[PDB]
Structure formats: C-alpha cells, structure tokens
Amino acid sequence: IVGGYTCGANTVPYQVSLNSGYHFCGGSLINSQWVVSAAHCYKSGIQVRLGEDNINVVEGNEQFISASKSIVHPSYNSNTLNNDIMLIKLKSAASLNSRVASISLPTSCASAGTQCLISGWGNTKSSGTSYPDVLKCLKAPILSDSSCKSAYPGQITSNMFCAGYLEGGKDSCQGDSGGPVVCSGKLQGIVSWGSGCAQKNKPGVYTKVCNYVSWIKQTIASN
Ligand SMILES: N=C(N)N1CCCCC1
Numbered sequence: 597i598v599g600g601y602t603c604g605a606n607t608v609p610y611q612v613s614l615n616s617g618y619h620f621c622g623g624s625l626i627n628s629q630w631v632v633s634a635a636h637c638y639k640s641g642i643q644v645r646l647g648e649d650n651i652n653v654v655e656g657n658e659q660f661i662s663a664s665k666s667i668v669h670p671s672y673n674s675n676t677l678n679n680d681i682m683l684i685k686l687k688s689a690a691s692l693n694s695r696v697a698s699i700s701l702p703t704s705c706a707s708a709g710t711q712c713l714i715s716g717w718g719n720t721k722s723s724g725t726s727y728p729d730v731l732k733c734l735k736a737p738i739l740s741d742s743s744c745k746s747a748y749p750g751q752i753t754s755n756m757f758c759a760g761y762l763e764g765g766k767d768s769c770q771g772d773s774g775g776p777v778v779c780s781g782k783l784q785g786i787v788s789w790g791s792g793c794a795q796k797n798k799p800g801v802y803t804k805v806c807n808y809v810s811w812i813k814q815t816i817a818s819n
Pocket residue numbers: 767768769770771772773787788789790791792793794799800801
C-alpha cells in the first residue's frame with residue numbers, strides 16, 4: 597500500500613497472509629474454513645496465516661493453517677486478468693474471535709463514489725522498494741466505470757472496477773494482490789492489477805466480487 601496508514605494490530609480481522617515460506621499475497625476469510633484471493637496468486641503449498649499484524653514476529657494472535665485445496669475460477673484468463681478470483685479451503689476450521697473474523701459477501705454491487713478500505717503488506721513505494729512488515733490500510737473511493745475505462749482503454753471488463761485516486765499518490769501495490777476491498781462492511785473487491793503503483797491516471801483495478809457470489813456459494817456448498 598502506497599500512501600496509506602498503519603492499520604493497528606488486528607483491526608482488519610478478516611485479512612489473511614498467504615505464505616509459501618514468505619508472504620506472497622493477501623486474502624480474505626469468508627467463513628471459518630474458506631479464504632478468497634486472486635487467481636494470479638495461485639501456487640501449490642500454501643499456508644494461510646490468520647490473526648497477523650507483524651508478519652515477521654509471533655505476537656500471540658496468529659493461527660497458521662495449511663490449505664487442503666485451491667479452486668481457481670473456471671474462466672480465469674491470465675493474459676487479461678479477467679475473472680481474477682480463487683477460493684482456498686483450510687485443512688481445519690479457524691477459531692473465530694474479535695481478532696480473527698470473517699467478512700460478509702455482498703448482496704448488491706457497490707456504486708461509484710462509495711468509500712472502501714483496502715489493506716495489505718505490499719510495497720509502500722511507487723519508485724523503489726520498501727516492504728513494511730505490519731499491515732497497512734488505505735481508504736479510497738470506487739471510481740466510475742467511465743473513468744476506469746478511460747484510464748485503461750481496451751482492458752476493463754464487467755468483472756473489474758477501479759478504485760483510488762486519479763491524481764496518484766495512494767494505491768495498492770506489489771504484495772497486496774489477493775487482499776480485500778471492503779465497503780460498508782462487505783467484501784466488494786480483490787486487489788488484482790494496475791500499471792505501476794500510485795501513478796497519475798492509473799488507478800488500481802479490482803475484481804468485482806458481487807459478480808461471483810453465486811459461484812462462491814455453490815462451490816463452498818459442494819467442496
Ligand atoms: N493497484 C495496483 N497498482 N496494483 C495491484 C497490485 C499489484 C501491482 C499493481
């Protein structure tokens with residue numbers, strides 16, 4: 597996250613870190629046994645880390661649970677990033693409390709102008725590299741589809757939305773991928789792609805979760 601603030605320990609209780617020896621992507625806990633992330637974060641050998649603040653120090657609220665299966669969306673396209681969404685089942689259920697909690701799925705799609713919270717452990721610089729260790733947060737609005745399509749001609753599908761600031765300076769960045777965009781207490785987006793980080797006229801692009809609720813619910817019910 598570029599241009600954000602330190603969230604505070606366990607203030608984003610649905611945020612997870614995906615670990616394969618190191619943090620590589622975020623995700624969101626949607627019930628006691630399932631996480632949603634980005635398809636472009638897929639790899640074998642995932643440990644899900646819940647209850648994290650500092651990802652390099654054991655602070656006492658963590659739960660570390662390995663994945664039993666991963667399900668990439670059936671129509672994910674790695675060239676265009678259309679349908680950039682993946683479900684991860686935990687080998688055992690997490691123990692839910694005030695510091696480790698699920699986030700609700702939306703029952704309607706959020707409108708442009710809605711303010712949302714984006715979080716992650718990704719790079720904090722638009723030029724160069726500095727990875728922060730504690731969780732960072734950013735408040736940002738959803739942008740109109742017309743603004744989004746004008747920023748990225750020929751690239752925005754109905755399964756994507758833009759959020760952030762056209763003036764630049766505040767955005768998600770590398771290592772935030774897969775993490776949550778929460779608006780009015782519901783998971784509306786997944787950190788997906790963008791050109792660089794925090795550049796003028798290049799806002800972040802997010803997977804539009806409200807289009808996937810039926811697939812999520814059906815998949816969980818059957819796996
Ligand atoms: N929001 C931006 N700029 N991103 C998404 C996360 C990876 C880098 C590009």
